[PDB]
Amino acid sequence: SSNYVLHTNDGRTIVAEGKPKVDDETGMISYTDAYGQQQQINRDNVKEMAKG
Amino acid sequence: SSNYVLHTNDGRTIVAEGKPKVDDETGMISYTDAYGQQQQINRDNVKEMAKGK
Amino acid sequence: SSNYVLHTNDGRTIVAEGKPKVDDETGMISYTDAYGQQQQINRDNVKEMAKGK
Amino acid sequence: SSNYVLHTNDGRTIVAEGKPKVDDETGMISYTDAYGQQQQINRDNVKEMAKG
Amino acid sequence: SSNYVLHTNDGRTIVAEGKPKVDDETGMISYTDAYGQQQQINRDNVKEMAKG
Amino acid sequence: SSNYVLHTNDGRTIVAEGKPKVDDETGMISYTDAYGQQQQINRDNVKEMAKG
Amino acid sequence: SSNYVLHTNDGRTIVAEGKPKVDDETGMISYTDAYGQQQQINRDNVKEMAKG
Q: Residues of chain B whose C-beta is under 8 A from some C-beta in C?
A: 19-22, 29, 43-44, 46-52
Strand C3-8 to C13-17 pairing: antiparallel
B30 to A11, B18, B52, C10, G51: CA distances (angstroms): 21, 10, 17, 26, 27
Closest CA to C4 of G22, F39, B23, D39: D39
Torsion angle, alpha carbons of C51, C53, D6, D10, to 10: 130
- Note the residue count of chain C: 53
Subunits with 3+ C-beta pairs closer than 8 A to C: B, D
Number of CB pairs, chain A paired with chain B, less than 8 A apart: 38
Beta carbons within 10 angstroms of residue E5's beta carbon: 14
Residues of C in contact with D42 (CB under 8 A): 43-44, 46-48
Sign of the CA dihedral running E19, E20, E21, E23 = positive
Instruction: Report the 10 Å Cβ neighbour count for D30.
Output: 19
Coil/strand/helix, residue C43 = helix
Chains with 3+ CB–CB pairs under 8 A to D are: C, E
Q: Name C24's Cβ contacts closer than 8 Å, sequence gap at least 6.
A: none
Q: Which residues contact E30 (CB under 8 A, 6 or more apart)?
A: E20, E21, E22, E23, E38, E39, E40
Q: How far are the Cα atoms of A32, B33, D6, E8, E10 from residue E40, in angstroms, in the given order?
A: 46, 46, 9, 12, 15
Experimental method: X-ray
What torsion do the CA atoms of F23, C43, D11, F46 make, to the nearest 10 degrees? Answer: 30
Please name which of F47, F38, F41, F13 lies closest in space to residue F27, comparing C-alpha atoms: F41
Please report the resolution in angstroms. 1.9
CB-based burial label for F46 (10 Å; 0-12, 13-18, 19+): buried
B35 to chain C, closest Cα gap in Å:
22
Contacts of B26 in chain C (CB under 8 A): none
A 10 A CB-CB count for F38 gives 16
Contact across the interface for E51 and F28, Cβ inside 8 Å: no
Q: Cβ neighbours of residue F8 under 8 Å, at least 6 residues apart? A: F14, F41, F45, F46, F47
Strands (E), chain D: 3-8, 13-17, 21-23, 28-32, 38-41, 46-51
State the nearest Cα–Cα gap between A24 and chain G, in angstroms.
Answer: 9
- B32 CA: distance to closest CA in chain A (Å): 9
Taking a C-beta distance cutoff of 8 angstroms, is the pair A31, G49 a contact?
Answer: no
User: What is the residue type of G4?
Assistant: Y
E in contact with C (at least 3 C-beta pairs within 8 A): no
| B42-B45-B47-B50 Cα dihedral, nearest 10 degrees | -50
- Residue A49's φ and ψ, nearest 5 degrees, are -150, 140
d(CA B41, CA G43): 20
The residue among F21, G30, G38 whose CA lies nearest residue A26 is G30
Is residue B31 within 8 Å of B17, Cβ to Cβ? yes
| Domains along the sequence of chain F with CATH | 1-52 (2.30.30.100)
For the stretch E30-51, what's the b/e string if a residue is b when 16 or more beta carbons lie within 10 angstroms of its beta carbon?
Answer: bbeeeeeebbbbbbebbbbbbe
- With an 8 Å Cβ cutoff, the interface of chain F facing chain G consists of 9, 19-22, 29, 43-44, 46-52
Sign of CA dihedral B13, B14, B20, B26: negative
Distances (CA, A) of B44 to A48, B7, B37, C42, F9: 10, 12, 21, 8, 23
The residues, any chain, with a CB within 8 Å of residue A24's CB and separated by 6 or more, are none
The C-alpha atoms of residue C27 and residue G5 are separated, in whole angstroms, by: 33
- How many B-C residue pairs are in contact by the CB < 8 A criterion? 38
Per the CB < 8 Å rule, is E51 touching F37? yes
| Whole-angstrom distance, CA of residue C12 vs CA of residue G35 | 55
